[PDB]
Design a protein around this ligand. Structure first.
Ligand SMILES: O=C(c1ccccc1)N1[C@H](c2ccc(OCCN3CCCCC3)cc2)c2ccc(O)cc2CC12CC2
Ligand SMILES: O=C(c1ccccc1)N1[C@H](c2ccc(OCCN3CCCCC3)cc2)c2ccc(O)cc2CC12CC2
Lengths: 221, 215
C-alpha cells in the first residue's frame, strides 16, 4: 500500500556523503563525490519496489538514462533550505560565483538554484521527494519481454501516483489541491530532465558510466 | 481575468485555437521550410491560450523560445498517432524510420511517443491541454517577475482542473483520474528530452526579435 511504499522508499534512501579550498580542484572534488554517490545509487535503485523485477539489462538502461537526474534532484533537495547555495556535500557548499570558473557551469548552476527555490516555494516534503526520485528512475528510460517490462514499470508508476495522492490526502489537502500539487510536482521533472541534458552536454565538453560498468554494479553475486 | 473560465470554457477556447495543418512545399529543406511556416501559426495559437497575452511581451517571447520545438514535436506526434511506424509531418510528407546522422535516434523517440499516445487513447481535448502546459511550463523556471510566475502557475492549475474535469466526464474513477493525469504529464518530460536532443541534432533557433515581431 501507499504507506508501505513510502516506508520502503524512506528506508532505501542513500546516505549524505562528504567531499584552503582550491577552485582548480573543484571539478576533481565534484567528480570523486559523484563516483561515490553512484555506488549508493545502485543500492538505492535495487530497493525501489518493482525495479529488480525487471531484467538486468533494462535495469541498466533505466539507470543509464536517470543517473544524472537522480544526482541532481538529490543535490537540489540537499540544497532546498540554503537559498542561493548548492550543498554538494555538508563540507562543500558553493555559490554561483564559484561556478564561474568552468565554462557553461553557471548556467546549469542557476537552473539547479531555480529548482531548489521552486521546492522551497512548494514546501516539498521528504515523503514526496523520495516518490519523485523513484519516478525519475522508472520513467526517464521507459520511452514481448519489453511489452511485459514496460507494462510493469507503468503499473509501478501508477502505484507511486496513488502514493503521492495519499500523502496529499493525509496532509488535509482538498481533492482539487491534490490534483494541482501532483501536477505541479510532475511538471518539475520536465525541468530536471532539461538540466540533466544540459549537464550531459557539459560533461562531454571536457564521463558517463558505461553499460558494462553499470551492469557490474547491478549484477551482484 | 482569464482565470475565470470554466473547465468546459477552457476546453472550447483551446479547441478553437488549434492551428491549421500545413503542407510541404532535399528531405531536410522541406522539414526546415515546414517548421518555419508552422512557427507563425504557433504564435497565433499561443495568443489564444487563456492567460498567455496577460503576460508581458518579454515573458511571452521567453516562453515561446523554450517551448517552440516541443510544441512542434507534440503536434507531429499527435498527427502521426494514427500511422504506426511513420511520422506524418504533413499530409503530403509521410516518412518512415528508414528515411531517417543522428536523425533515426530522434525519429525513433517520436515514433515511441506517438505509439504511447495510441495505446493511451489520447483525446483531442486532452492533447490541446497538454500543448498549453508545454507553452506555459517549459520556460517558467528559467526567467513583477514573481507576479508573472504566479500567474503562469495559476493558469497551469486551471488546465490541471480542466484535464481532471475531462477525465471525470469520461467516467474515469478518481484513482484512474490521478493515474491518467500523472501518465500524461510524465510524457511531457520525454518530449522535453526529444526537444533537447533535437536541438543538439539541429545544431550539428528563432531569435527574440523574430518572435517579438510575429507577436
Ligand atoms: O559539478 C557538477 C556541476 C554543477 C553545476 C553546474 C555544472 C556541473 N555536478 C557534479 C557531477 C560531477 C561529475 C559527474 O560525472 C562524473 C563522471 N562519471 C564518471 C564515472 C561514472 C559516473 C561519473 C556527475 C555529476 C555533481 C556531484 C555530486 C552530486 O550529488 C551532484 C552533482 C551535479 C552535477 C551535474 C550537475
Ligand atoms: O525534421 C525534423 C526531425 C524529425 C525526426 C528526426 C530528426 C529531425 N523536425 C522538423 C524540424 C525541422 C527544423 C527545425 O528547425 C528549423 C530552424 N528554424 C527553426 C525555427 C525558426 C528558424 C530556425 C525544427 C523542427 C519538424 C518540422 C515540422 C514539425 O511539425 C515537426 C518537426 C520535428 C523535428 C524536430 C523533430
Amino acid at each position: 500500500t501507499a504507506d508501505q511504499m513510502v516506508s520502503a522508499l524512506l528506508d532505501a534512501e542513500p546516505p549524505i556523503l562528504y567531499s584552503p579550498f582550491s577552485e582548480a580542484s573543484m571539478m576533481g572534488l565534484l567528480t570523486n563525490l559523484a563516483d561515490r554517490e553512484l555506488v549508493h545509487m545502485i543500492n538505492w535503485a535495487k530497493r525501489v519496489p518493482g525495479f529488480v523485477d525487471l531484467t538486468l539489462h533494462d535495469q541498466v538502461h533505466l539507470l543509464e538514462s536517470a543517473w544524472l537526474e537522480i544526482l541532481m534532484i538529490g543535490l537540489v533537495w540537499r540544497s532546498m533550505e540554503h537559498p542561493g547555495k548548492l550543498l554538494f556535500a555538508p563540507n562543500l557548499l558553493l555559490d554561483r560565483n564559484q561556478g564561474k570558473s568552468v565554462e557553461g557551469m553557471v548556467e546549469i548552476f542557476d537552473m539547479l538554484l531555480a529548482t531548489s527555490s521552486r521546492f522551497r516555494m512548494m514546501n516539498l516534503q521528504g515523503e514526496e521527494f523520495v516518490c519523485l526520485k523513484s519516478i525519475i528512475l522508472l520513467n526517464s528510460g521507459v520511452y514481448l519481454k519489453s511489452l511485459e517490462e514496460k507494462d510493469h514499470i507503468h503499473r509501478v508508476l501508477d502505484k507511486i501516483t496513488d502514493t503521492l495522492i495519499h500523502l496529499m490526502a493525509k496532509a488535509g489537502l482538498t481533492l482539487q489541491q491534490q490534483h494541482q500539487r501532483l501536477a505541479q510536482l510532475l511538471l518539475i521533472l520536465s525541468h530536471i530532465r532539461h538540466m540533466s541534458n544540459k549537464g550531459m552536454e557539459h560533461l562531454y565538453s571536457m564521463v558517463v558510466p558505461s553499460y558494462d560498468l553499470l551492469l557490474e554494479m547491478l549484477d551482484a553475486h
